[PDB]
Write a protein that binds this ligand. Sequence first.
Ligand code: HEM
Ligand code: NAG
Ligand code: NAG
Ligand code: NAG
Ligand code: NAG
Ligand code: NAG
Ligand code: CL
Ligand code: MG
Length: 326
Amino acid sequence: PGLPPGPLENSSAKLVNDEAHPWKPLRPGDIRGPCPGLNTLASHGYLPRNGVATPAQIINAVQEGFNFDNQAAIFATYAAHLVDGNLITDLLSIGRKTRLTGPDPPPPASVGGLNEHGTFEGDASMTRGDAFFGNNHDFNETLFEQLVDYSNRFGGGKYNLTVAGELRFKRIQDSIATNPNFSFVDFRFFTAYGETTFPANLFVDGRRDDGQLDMDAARSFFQFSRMPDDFFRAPSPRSGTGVEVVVQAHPMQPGRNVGKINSYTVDPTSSDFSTPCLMYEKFVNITVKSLYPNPTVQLRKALNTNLDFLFQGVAAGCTQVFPYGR
Ligand code: HEM
Ligand SMILES: *[C@@H]1O[C@H](CO)[C@@H](O)[C@H](O)[C@H]1NC(C)=O
Ligand SMILES: *[C@@H]1O[C@H](CO)[C@@H](O)[C@H](O)[C@H]1NC(C)=O
Ligand SMILES: *[C@@H]1O[C@H](CO)[C@@H](O)[C@H](O)[C@H]1NC(C)=O
Ligand SMILES: *[C@@H]1O[C@H](CO)[C@@H](O)[C@H](O)[C@H]1NC(C)=O
Ligand SMILES: *[C@@H]1O[C@H](CO)[C@@H](O)[C@H](O)[C@H]1NC(C)=O
Ligand SMILES: [Cl-]
Ligand SMILES: [Mg+2]
């Protein structure tokens, strides 16, 4: 495994839809998944165009192409890789499970790519359906049209943090009403809020950086994995700034439906925004450990290396935990 890349040496706004990074359509076998950011980076050649990449490639791409901040890049990438990637070959699919990530580890590890439900990916996504409904990864036109409607109603036709606050809650309530297996705890509880800020913070042309995403650009990213012509990345490193506005709009507790619709039951063992270090500890002690309960020598070493890298992305003040010793 390569070392996690450091922050950008020059984080100014600049043209990122440039001659070296043209949009190209998918070829047979090219993989796209539930993340429009990574999808767009792959479709502009910031990542390998087939959608299989190393953690270091992913971190470099999100920084270079979108000015995603280093700490957020490290945490997200190594979390995803630990639960969805191949730790021996150092390869992660940004979408469906693929033989291209190499020989699989033993069960119960799945190495399912970002499409794997319940490891990283989860319910109440904005433009992707819940896994229960049959497809957690493809762009969904009806859900996107709802995003447009919420942008018209709360953002004057643009997507901004006010729109994010209302749409986040709408998607939660729709999943409660229709998905008897709806889960909204721990890792997903956190990412579900942060992700709604990303279109406002990262898909807005960096010469403006005003938090108001137009619907032409929104469709280009969300559906076609395509930067607008002449797209400048954000003018400084960021990820989830303004997430407090989204939470404040409709504060929620972590919980799940309990095998029936309209049965949302709060989980007091879940982390929430008052316990960010617990989210990290549970992710390692429960989620990662359950995939690799008794790893053989080379897997144990790879796990420990990637867990060290994950901890570099954890907010200061948390204590590192060691599921396979020091
Ligand atoms: C740094 C590594 C990244 C990883 C591993 C990653 C992975 C993911 C995954 C797995 C999801 C699906 C979440 C779910 O259903 O629970 C997601 C959602 C999302 N990601 Fe990323 N992501 C990364 C960076 C970024 C960046 C840099 C951007 C924007 C420039 C971005 C924009 C989004 C958006 C907008 C969604 C929400 C899609 C929707 O709900 O319709 N992500 N990401
Ligand atoms: C950083 O990049 C910007 C945009 O390409 C450029 O104008 C600026 O001069 C660069 N700064 C340094 C210190 O090289
Ligand atoms: C149902 O929820 C459980 C966890 O509560 C999860 O393991 C499973 O993958 C979920 N399946 C779908 C399709 O939502
Ligand atoms: C898209 O989402 C809608 C609304 O939840 C759902 O009814 C539909 O089956 C999804 N899939 C497609 C292919 O439209
Ligand atoms: C979203 O846009 C609407 C209409 O322009 C505006 O009232 C609201 O203040 C905006 N919110 C943010 C956070 O920019
Ligand atoms: C995680 O495991 C460590 C021991 O390796 C323990 O000290 C810590 O309390 C655990 N945290 C949780 C939330 O289970
Ligand atoms: Cl940074
Ligand atoms: Mg999802």
